């Protein structure tokens, strides 16, 4: 009767619904009883410190468990042959065959092999022993506590910031650009120059010797002379053995381009110069806004002045400043959309341009990292549109936004939604149509009647970057071009070596199979956008519920009248777009993994011929690569892929259990539960025990959330088991 | 009483829990400790030496496996990466123990932060610097053997390192401090 | 493994006693009128 202490409406519910709903509403502080705006920003401030500490505790644990139970020191000696260890296994359910099957990694105990790539990241940035891995763990344990204390401290009466502080847009932007982004990019440049690059060259540099070991022989004298190019002199030779002194240069700031020939990773001196340059640019950016000394910009002034005089945007951005500052959901949506794009850039640029030594020869790590971050990207992208829907319902005031860009969006929302509807159908009819054409034509023994479109636009873009594979002879591929001649003294020689070797993933060769899947990925991006945009733009009202904003973000329906109104809320379009987000990241990660496993075998022609029809995806990708995974145990034994073989079935089970919450709805279940309530009261020796909360069927919205979670969890566990075990089992 | 082979941490308790007022008795309990900060730095350095030296047979055992193989190649990368990591760490720690053993407390930070202009006596003028020279020559031998393809050369050179490091510890008799 | 006894101590406690105690005490908190 007191668990939802933030909600008197739930704490007076006599059912089991109170426990469920109190847990699901706990972090929605805006809806809690008696919430002021002061307290809302102060609880968010403290719980951001608490989240930060969780990230530091998660990182310290990964460092600690590798220092304690890993084979980091053995892996560092021979990184292409040793398989990195994540942590050890202590499971009393194991048989003795399982204990033996997991005793790989060069150790005497059951262990889990790591797919996270943390060995390659810690090696590349300098870590060499277990003792500095543990030193880093200790620092993060300290940092987590410092941020736990800071969270508690800024909840104290004297240290609780005012709303005027929380809404100082110009001072926060100045510090986050120049200090949080810019200075720490500069400080990371310092770490590479002072530690990572010297230890890539055999020389240990730690806290013990850093103040007496110069990063450069000349040493901070060329910098204070303008002879900056003296720091690019003598780069690492192509004979350099990473981690040792042989083949090593003395440069600390280069723009060579391409990959270190032995690690197949970006040069550490390119990376240090990247972070120095980015850091300088960001620090300059962090001086844009006026804080206390009369120079800089008012953000309000810039937005008000950007109304095009032709009048096509109406009042322009007048009143957007107040709308964004007052709406945390508008801020969250911008942050998640921006974060969602970056984590997709991270996935794309880390497989094509790897920075860590000897990664991209770890096919399991390379596959898991891509899959992980595209799935994070799809979740972040859904959340941005969901919180844009929450903004319009809850935080958008149409009278402070008269004729804005925001109000004019809502004025032509049917133009936007119907044109997404057309482009989704346009992509879907023909992308599926060509694939079905190709399947039918290949099934009838006539693969030469397939519709095979060459992706010339992308091939021309590859050639513009110097790819000499399609004879396009444009820009960088052209020998005598203004573009090619301009970059020739810097990165062009190294980049052309990197992009015209067929031994990496920089601008991979593409054909008709890649054309077809990109248009499928285009179909899924526009269709997911459609559901989410329709959810955001119809959130305030529609023709079925013109007063939909009076009911909130998540409500079950408006009942069976007016034809029926199931899934009419803006929340329900988040629900529906979650299936389309899972489908799209499936299409993306299925494509990435099949294209890579066929290349890693040396059989890229298997992808080239089989990707143009759907049976090629079914038999040559899903069915063919299933066999090491589903043989992780059998009546003839088990091996270390037994855990992924079990997670695979586990994922199919959770996914299918979600169907029960999504297909069968409440009325069936409430009537069963009434027969169970009767039987308990009538059964002797059992009616001595009484529920405190009346057992009820899950709510309409809750079952959608429970089924969505089960569907989503089953989706993730199945693919992760497949993408890791099929890659592990093949090694190629 | 000695240093753990793999961890390099003070292992034996030394059988010294004396509260003993008046004479401190070097009571290993803190606030009864008679050890200087310099002694504690010396035990850390000796622990580093133990980890490196115990790791020396790992290279010796790995090199023996390499030589035994159907076709022998003497992984120059492994031998060099051992030398770049474990072997160099040995030499620098041995040099630092010599520095403290010769100049004295100034090397413990008495003269300040490590500087490009260290205002103290160098690692020379130490009776145990000769052992540091032995390890330095051995590192050169390890690299030279790896470039040449000599399996026996790597094994003998690593053995030279092991004897020299053990000799260093015996002459130094590093104070075992548990505080 | 160093301190090899720790998994056989901490895993049953973390995996059985820790949930057994939070479920026991959460149940009391969610089923109290005051």
């Amino acid at each position: 009767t007191k668990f939802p202490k933030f909600s008197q409406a739930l704490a007076q519910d006599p059912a089991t619904r109170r426990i469920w709903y109190g847990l699901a509403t706990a972090h929605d502080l805006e809806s809690h009883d008696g919430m002021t705006e002061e307290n809302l920003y102060q609880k968010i401030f403290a719980s951001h410190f608490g989240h930060l500490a969780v990230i530091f505790l998660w990182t310290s644990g990964n460092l600690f468990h590798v220092a304690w139970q890993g084979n980091f020191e053995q892996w560092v000696l021979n990184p292409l042959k040793v398989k990195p260890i994540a942590h050890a296994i202590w499971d009393p359910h194991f048989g003795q065959p399982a204990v033996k099957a997991f005793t790989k990694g060069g150790v005497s105990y059951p262990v889990n092999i790591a797919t996270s790539g943390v060995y390659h990241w810690w090696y590349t940035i300098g870590m060499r022993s277990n003792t500095d891995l543990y030193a880093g763990s200790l620092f993060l344990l300290f940092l987590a506590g410092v941020f736990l204390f800071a969270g508690w401290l800024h909840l104290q009466p004297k240290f609780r910031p005012g709303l005027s502080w929380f809404k100082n847009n110009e001072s926060r932007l100045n510090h986050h650009l120049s200090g949080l982004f810019g200075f720490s990019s500069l400080a990371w440049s310092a770490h590479l120059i002072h530690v990572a690059i010297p230890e890539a060259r055999g020389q240990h540099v730690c806290w013990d010797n850093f103040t007496k070991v110069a990063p450069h022989p000349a040493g901070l004298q060329p910098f204070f002379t303008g002879n900056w190019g003296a720091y690019a002199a003598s780069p690492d030779t192509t004979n350099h053995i990473f981690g040792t002194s042989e083949g090593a240069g003395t440069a600390i700031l280069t723009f060579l381009g391409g990959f270190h020939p032995q690690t197949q990773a970006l040069w550490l001196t390119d990376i240090a110069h990247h972070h120095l340059a980015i850091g300088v640019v960001f620090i300059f950016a962090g001086h844009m806004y006026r804080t206390n000394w009369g120079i800089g910009h008012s953000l309000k002034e810039i937005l008000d002045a950007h109304r095009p005089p032709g009048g096509r945007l109406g009042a322009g951005h007048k009143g957007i400043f107040e709308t964004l500052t007052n709406s945390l959901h508008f801020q969250l949506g911008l942050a998640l959309a921006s974060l969602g794009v970056i984590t997709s850039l991270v996935a794309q640029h880390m497989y094509a341009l790897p920075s860590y030594a000897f990664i991209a020869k770890d096919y399991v790590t390379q596959s898991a990292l891509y899959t992980h971050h595209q799935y994070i990207a799809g979740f972040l992208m859904v959340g941005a549109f969901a919180h844009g829907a929450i903004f319009f319902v809850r935080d958008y005031d149409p009278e402070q936004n008269k004729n804005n860009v925001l109000a004019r969006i809502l004025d032509h929302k049917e133009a936007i939604i119907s044109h997404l509807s057309w482009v989704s159908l346009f992509l879907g009819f023909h992308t599926l149509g060509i694939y079905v054409h190709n399947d039918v034509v290949v099934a009838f023994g006539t693969p030469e009647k397939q519709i095979l479109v060459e992706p010339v636009f992308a091939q021309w873009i590859q050639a513009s970057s110097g790819k000499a594979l399609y004879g396009f002879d444009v820009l960088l591929s052209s020998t005598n071009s203004v573009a090619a001649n301009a970059s020739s003294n810097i990165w062009l020689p190294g980049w052309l070596e990197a992009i015209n070797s067929g031994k990496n993933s920089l601008f991979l060769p593409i054909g008709p199979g890649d054309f077809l899947i990109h248009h499928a990925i285009a179909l899924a991006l526009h269709t997911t956008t459609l559901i989410l945009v329709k959810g955001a733009l119809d959130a305030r009202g529609s023709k079925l519920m013109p007063d939909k904003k009076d009911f909130g973000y998540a409500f079950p329906c408006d009942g069976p009248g007016r034809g029926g109104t199931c899934d009419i809320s803006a929340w329900d379009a988040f629900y529906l777009s979650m299936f389309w987000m899972l489908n799209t990241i499936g299409w993306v990660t299925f494509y990435w993994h099949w294209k890579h496993i066929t290349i890693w075998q040396g059989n890229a022609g298997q992808f080239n011929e089989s990707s143009t029809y759907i049976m090629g995806w079914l038999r040559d990708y899903l069915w063919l690569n299933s066999s090491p995974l589903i043989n992780g145990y059998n009546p003839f034994g088990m091996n270390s892929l037994s855990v992924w073989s079990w997670m695979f079935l586990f994922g199919h089970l959770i996914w299918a259990t979600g169907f029960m919450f999504l297909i069968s709805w409440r009325g069936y279940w409430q009537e069963l539960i009434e027969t169970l309530v009767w039987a308990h009261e009538r059964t002797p020796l059992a009616n001595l025990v009484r529920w405190k909360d009346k057992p009820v069927a899950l709510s309409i919205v809750q079952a959608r959330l429970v089924g969505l979670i089960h569907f989503t969890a089953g989706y993730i566990f199945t693919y992760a088991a497949f993408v890791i075990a099929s890659t592990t089992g093949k090694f190629g | 009483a000695s240093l753990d082979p793999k961890t390099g941490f003070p292992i034996q308790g030394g059988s010294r829990e004396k509260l003993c007022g008046g004479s401190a008795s070097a009571g290993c309990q803190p606030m009864t400790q008679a050890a200087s900060i310099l002694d504690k730095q010396r035990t850390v350095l000796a622990g580093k030496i133990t980890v490196a030296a115990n790791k020396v047979p790992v290279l010796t055992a790995a090199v023996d496996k390499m030589k035994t193989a159907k076709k022998p190649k003497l992984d120059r990368d492994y031998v060099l990466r051992y030398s770049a990591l474990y072997l160099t760490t040995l030499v620098d720690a041995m040099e630092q123990y010599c520095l403290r053993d010769a100049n004295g407390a100034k090397a413990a930070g008495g003269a300040g932060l490590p500087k490009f202009k260290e205002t103290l006596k160098p690692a020379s003028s130490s009776s145990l610097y000769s052992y540091v020279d032995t390890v330095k020559s051995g590192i050169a031998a390890v690299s030279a053997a790896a470039k040449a393809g000599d399996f026996d050369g790597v094994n003998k050179a690593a053995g030279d390192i092991k004897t020299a490091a053990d000799s260093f510890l015996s002459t130094a008799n590093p104070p075992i401090i548990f505080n | 493994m160093t301190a090899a006894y720790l998994p056989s101590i901490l895993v049953p406690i973390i995996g059985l006693i820790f949930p057994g105690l939070v479920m026991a005490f959460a149940f009391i908190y969610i089923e109290q009128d005051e």
Binding site: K43, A46, S47, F49, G50, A53, L57, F64, A67, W68, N130, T131, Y134, S137, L138, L141, F142, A144, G145, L148, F149, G151, W152, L155, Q156 | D4, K6, T7, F9, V51 | T2, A3, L6
Partner: peptide, 30 residues
């Protein structure tokens, strides 16, 4: 390698974090 004493240092510092996490959580709970 890591000594058991070093593991015990980590358990002390993580305990300090557990105590600070409780206090931050109680402050957030009010």
């Amino acid at each position: 390698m890591i000594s058991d004493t070093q593991i015990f240092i980590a358990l002390i510092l993580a305990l300090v974090s557990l105590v600070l996490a409780i206090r931050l959580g109680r402050a957030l709970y009010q």
